Amino acid sequence: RSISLVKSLTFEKERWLNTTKQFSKTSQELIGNCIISSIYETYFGHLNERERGDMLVILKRLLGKFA
């Protein structure tokens, strides 16, 4: 049973390996993601779709400006 369980969890193992590999990228981008999430939470309740898109482009380019 243990051998069958080990052999039957290759997909779970490679998914866990992929998540551990992508943990570096998620931790690198955590602060920016929190910034932009709070920006949506407190700045976009009263804006239209095209205004939201334009302000999102402005925010993205200005956040990439500061590296």
Partner: peptide, 11 residues
């Protein structure tokens, strides 16, 4: 999981 695999390989 790695510890279980190592134990299975050793035995």
């Amino acid at each position: 999981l790695n510890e279980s695999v190592l134990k299975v390989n050793e035995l």
